[PDB]
């Protein structure tokens, strides 16, 4: 059996968006999914498959159980809840992490062996309790990471210079938030790295290297306060990483891997250029940052850590 | 200047299903999103640009005004209101009416010379408003018509054979509704007629054809009835038309071309296999529909004469 | 593991255009190339590997031993020998099928478990032999059937109505000569029935389907007499089958299928509307085609055994 | 008109396979194909077109005469002639020369008004020739480059480290050859530079990248050596072109530009980083390269200059 089967959890704005892409791009022959909103989950299995005639790919697409986790290729993540009247941020967060928990159990307990992709956030945490709960090896739970705060970054680099995203070439470390790493020392363009078109070039200013950083990190702002929600983003990007894991493709990619002292940290997941392949995620790409950014990767990754002892089980 | 540029004129389900479909697909070059409300626009325009990176293809997206229609390859009509509980479905199509038409009035002044895709509904009817109104030939103006009920009616039989919905071929005529035509008599599956499979293989009977027919008459009722609304059908379907006209495929599509005796009929746009090239609609292709099957046909274009006939501007 | 692995066996223009073809429309993960010329094997992926950094996807492309088989999901055949003086053309068809025979042997020698997809011709014969010394299911071995023929028919059509080849549906029934069948009873364009252009439409007539047919029959001869050779066409054909073979598409081609009764035929492959997915060809579609078609479509299978016979092997 | 016209002059191995990469990824939707041997180039036209029916594109295809060239958004060329017996290299590139130029002049007088891209070697010479020829401003007139032995170049680095080639960012500047400059300065993977490999990580040595240069330098003979030609690389390396021009990607491509100060070289068409619009060629991105790297790169460009001045017009 060649046939592609992906498994999404979770039908909101996440899980529906991540399908379409999917399917317009043509990338998986099987999409189940699945949502405690069994009727809203059929909604959109209906909607989803209604104009496959006019796609350029033949894809199945259909609400399910977890039973069609047992010969699933990978599982992808998205399923959680709204911020309640009555509850701490914390609070939220202990409830998508049991939420995550259960479902993780659920999938396993129907004899999964395939790959898990987090992007439910918060993604570092909840990526490391799919490791705890699944009992599967660190590489083949592979979160979102920094894949939308990347393709954000080379988006406004684009724009500033005028040039394909899909030729900027760098990327944004730790975890998604005000202490995400924009490493500039490793971004280039046509291999004119950024700080040569600062120092040599005088293309760029510092100023607009900071301007820039901030647009990435107010990104999801922006765009909540003018439409209530993001998704489209993250849709691409995800889809992006089931691409590379299916095909093997052992491509590039900032996701969420399980660190063992590159970077100078350890025992988490976070945010760094990895190489993705059909195993998951097969290793990290050290990249050698400035001091500067280095220590804004290590306070990243103390709030992470902070966090996840708050939700973390033993 | 190779570069097309394509204009969605409203940021909703639809117009930004449609937006993500080309996007991910990788159509046209750039897409202009317009809507009264600007800021709803930006903000799906930002959602919309941020993946870029991980794409197949580098697409410009960005909000605007109707300026930009005039060097516009074609505009992408999805603009209106819905059914709210105050109303009626005749004081509905009335007020749709008169926002495509202030619309349209918009981009015509802009200078725009290029195609009209209608996608809004009541379709049909607006089709034909927006040719009265822009004074273009009526093959410059093109309506979605069928192609949503026929990817639908392709669904249907794909999972009814177990087969591959691109590999049905066959069309649902006239006005979407309990009046449109499932052209039976012209639908075939890897070259055996849909009547053949019936009248000599016996693998279907009668009645499935009549039940195949009514979900795809039910389809929006059963999707709205779980998720709300509909619109990743239509997004793929608008999307396979854009692709159609941007390519000169002279390919044939179910959408609202307008009749000058074919089938019948005269003076209204409706649903019918057509060929699409880089001038909008080229042809109809005259189907010897059974009498029975132009009974109904007929049935259908009256009922879109009756209502069109109290919107129509001259 | 998801990597699509498919090998393909002779290294010749269509091979190579296959691969390329493969390649540029990013169908498999892995591709080997095997070839009794080692060395033109290994120049062919050399040349086809070296643009992957400029293509749509990243496609691994090496040659190698039938060792690669093992774990292959497809293997393409597409090796033979061309005519030699003094030989038979007959003769070479014997050649060929034992030539493509051995290569079958050592394919299920390597521990091959996968699908077969038959190119070089005679398609329908050496779709037969493969089926033989393999020794796997017929719908496990499918041959290119009349593909091409299908392909360069819509072609046809779409010249003569100046519509998208790919709104052309209609086929070309038995085996690729002089017998191959023009289905027009069963082609479509827009949903209507050729004849219905004709009779009702007067768009066109009986003399335009005569020439179309034999322009397709003519075909191979055309373009012969002027670039020596045919390959870009057979390439796109096998990548089509080979797409929804990977991708379980349960699409509808006229690939070299086991007839049991099918058409009015039994025991040999031969191009016919089927069903395919990643098992290979599903179930056949058998068309009410017209008397006269059925005719002719007897008179092509009936000289396909006749060959059949003086190089079959004596068991399955 | 939305539709894109592209004619490619000459139907040898490099001509139909660049077609056939085309049709198959799906660019442009008309494909003219001229040859002084007609027949051959209706041969071609024939068997392109043929699988259509199953391709992921439309694409229409027919053998022409240069009036189709009027309306074409694109003319590619491939025509020219290879090596014989006494024959100097000299030689070839002067006949090639005399026909590139004629090619040029038919183009021209039947009013196109578009873009050129010039695959026939020698390519930067070539292209320069067409430039002057044509009389079209230098932006669109744009050579193949360096991007075939950049794709190798990729190609060698992604089978060395085991990842994806497209995941690997660096170039090959100058005129192919011995004298092409392989800038592991500015080559990176996954963000990490080349040097960062070798220098911190220690996982490549200094040899490693001396080999693979060589690979990269010696890509074409070793293909020759087994196969007789090259073509599936360079039809590759041609569509990714075209296909950035026709969609106005601003990709960056090292394509033959003009170089007018960069890299300290003036007046002369060569492989560098450029920005690719539909306009053809916008910019050159100047990378402050190694001064080991900027002689080898003027010993490159020196030798272009020498063979140019000899049919330069
Ligand atoms: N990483 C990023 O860049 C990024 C960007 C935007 C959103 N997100 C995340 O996407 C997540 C999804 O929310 P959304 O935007 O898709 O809208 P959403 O909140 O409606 O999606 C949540 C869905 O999960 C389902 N669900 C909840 N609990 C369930 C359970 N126990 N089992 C099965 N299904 C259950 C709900 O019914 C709901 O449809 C959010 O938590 C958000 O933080 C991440
Ligand atoms: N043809 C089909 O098959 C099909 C299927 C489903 C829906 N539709 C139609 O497509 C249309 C899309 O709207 P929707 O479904 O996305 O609901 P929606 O509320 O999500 O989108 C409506 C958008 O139209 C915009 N708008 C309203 N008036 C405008 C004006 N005067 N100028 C500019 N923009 C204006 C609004 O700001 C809003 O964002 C609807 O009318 C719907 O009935 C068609
Ligand atoms: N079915 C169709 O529609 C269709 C159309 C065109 C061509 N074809 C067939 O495709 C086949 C391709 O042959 P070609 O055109 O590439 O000629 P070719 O000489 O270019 O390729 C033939 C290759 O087979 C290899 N070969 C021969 N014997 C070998 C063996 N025992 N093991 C491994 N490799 C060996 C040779 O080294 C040679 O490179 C032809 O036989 C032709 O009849 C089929
Ligand atoms: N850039 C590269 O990667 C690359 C690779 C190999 C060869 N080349 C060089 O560029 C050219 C590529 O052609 P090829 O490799 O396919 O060899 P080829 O013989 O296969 O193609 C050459 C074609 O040019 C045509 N031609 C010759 N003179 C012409 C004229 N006056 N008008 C129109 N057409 C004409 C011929 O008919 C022939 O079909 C060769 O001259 C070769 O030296 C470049
Ligand atoms: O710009 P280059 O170096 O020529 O390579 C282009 C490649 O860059 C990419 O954007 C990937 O770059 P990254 O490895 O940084 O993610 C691909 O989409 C594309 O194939
Ligand atoms: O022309 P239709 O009926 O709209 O369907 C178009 C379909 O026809 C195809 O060309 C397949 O035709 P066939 O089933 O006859 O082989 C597909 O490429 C495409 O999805």
Same mark, same amino acid.
């Given at each position: 059996? +060649?046939?592609?089967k992906v498994?999404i959890?979770? +039908? &909101?704005?996440v899980?529906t968006?991540i399908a379409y892409?999917?399917?317009?791009?043509g990338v998986?022959?099987?999409?189940?999914?699945?949502?405690?909103?069994?009727?809203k989950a059929?909604?959109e299995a209906?909607?989803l498959?209604?104009?496959?005639?006019?796609?350029?790919?033949?894809? =199945?697409?259909?609400?399910? +159980?977890?039973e069609?986790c047992?010969?699933?290729?990978?599982?992808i993540?998205t399923?959680?809840?709204?911020?309640?009247?009555?509850?701490?941020?914390?609070?939220?967060?202990? #409830?998508?992490?049991t939420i #995550?928990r259960?479902?993780?159990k659920?999938?396993?307990?129907s004899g999964?062996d395939g790959?898990?992709?987090?992007?439910?956030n918060?993604?570092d945490?909840?990526?490391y309790? +799919?490791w705890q709960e699944?009992?599967?090896?660190?590489?083949?739970?592979?979160?979102?990471? #920094?894949?939308?705060?990347t393709?954000?970054?080379?988006?406004?680099?684009?724009?500033?210079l005028?040039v394909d995203?899909? =030729?900027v070439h760098g990327?944004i470390?730790?975890?998604?938030?005000?202490?995400?790493?924009?490493?500039? =020392?490793h971004?280039?363009?046509?291999?004119?790295?950024?700080?040569?078109?600062?120092?040599?070039?005088?293309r760029?200013?510092?100023?607009?290297?900071?301007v820039?950083?901030?647009?990435?990190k107010n990104?999801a702002?922006?765009?909540?306060?003018?439409?209530?929600?993001t998704?489209? &983003?993250?849709?691409?990007?995800t889809?992006?990483?089931?691409?590379?894991?299916?095909?093997?493709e052992?491509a590039?990619?900032p996701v969420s891997?399980y660190?063992?002292?590159?970077?100078?940290?350890?025992?988490?997941?976070?945010?760094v250029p990895?190489?993705?392949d059909?195993?998951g995620?097969?290793?990290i790409?050290d990249?050698?940052? #400035?001091?500067?950014?280095k220590?804004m990767?290590?306070?990243?990754? =103390?709030?992470?850590?902070?966090?996840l002892?708050?939700?973390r089980?033993e």
């Open positions: 059996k +060649t046939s592609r498994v959890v979770g +039908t &909101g704005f899980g968006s892409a999917m399917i317009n791009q998986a022959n099987e999409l189940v999914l699945i949502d405690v909103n069994q009727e059929e909604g209906l909607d498959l209604d104009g496959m005639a006019w796609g350029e790919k033949n894809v =199945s697409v259909w609400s399910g +159980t977890y069609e047992q010969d699933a290729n990978l599982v993540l399923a959680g809840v709204n911020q309640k009247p009555g509850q701490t941020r914390l609070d939220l967060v202990k #409830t998508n992490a #995550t259960q479902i993780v659920e999938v396993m307990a999964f790959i898990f992709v987090v992007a439910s918060p993604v945490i909840l990526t309790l +799919t699944s009992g599967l090896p660190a590489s083949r739970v592979v979160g979102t990471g #920094t894949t939308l705060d393709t954000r970054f080379r988006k406004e680099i684009a724009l500033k005028a995203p899909r =030729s990327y470390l730790g975890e998604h938030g005000d202490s995400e790493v924009a490493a500039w =020392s971004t280039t363009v046509g291999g004119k790295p950024i700080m040569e078109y600062v120092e040599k070039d005088h760029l200013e510092e100023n607009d290297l900071t820039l950083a901030d647009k990435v990104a702002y922006e765009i909540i306060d003018r439409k209530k929600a998704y489209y &983003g993250i849709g691409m990007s889809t992006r990483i089931v691409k590379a894991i299916l095909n093997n052992q590039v990619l891997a660190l063992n002292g590159e970077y100078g940290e350890e025992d988490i997941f976070t945010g990895s190489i993705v059909e195993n995620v097969r290793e790409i990249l050698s940052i #400035t001091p500067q950014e220590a990767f290590h306070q990243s990754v =103390s709030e992470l850590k902070a966090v002892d708050t939700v089980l």
